[PDB]
Amino acid sequence: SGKRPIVANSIQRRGKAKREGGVGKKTTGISKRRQYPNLQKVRVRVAGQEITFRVAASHIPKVYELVERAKGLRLEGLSPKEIKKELL
Template sequence: MSKVCEMCGKGPVVVNSVVRRGKARAAGGVGRKVTGVTKTRQVPNLQPLTVTRGGISLRVRVCTKCRRSLI
């Protein structure tokens, strides 16, 4: 099963999760330091939806944004 919306083509994206420690300079500290960078994967919220096209019922997987625009 593909993690892609069948209407708009929205798919998974890879982002960095950045972990920092320390106190900010503006708050009187020496500055925030990056202690770890981990790649994470964000997938779209896909929901099944039954759509009628030409008298035939099709079950499609669409993201919630497309689902709201259809209903």
């Protein structure tokens, strides 16, 4: 799947196998296929509650940066899912 700071769907794009030189010609065997977001869970503290985070390895940082933004954010009163909604 995709969402989070991330914002990256899995796209589908074809993998085309070739047989060849480069320096005599270069030929084939094409065929479609799915290509995924490296994407991981990010457990993290944030007020009360451990809030977690399906996200692209590429963007692990943005989460941490966004934990920071929230120190300067008013929240408590039991909000585990809701906290996450609040982030950004």
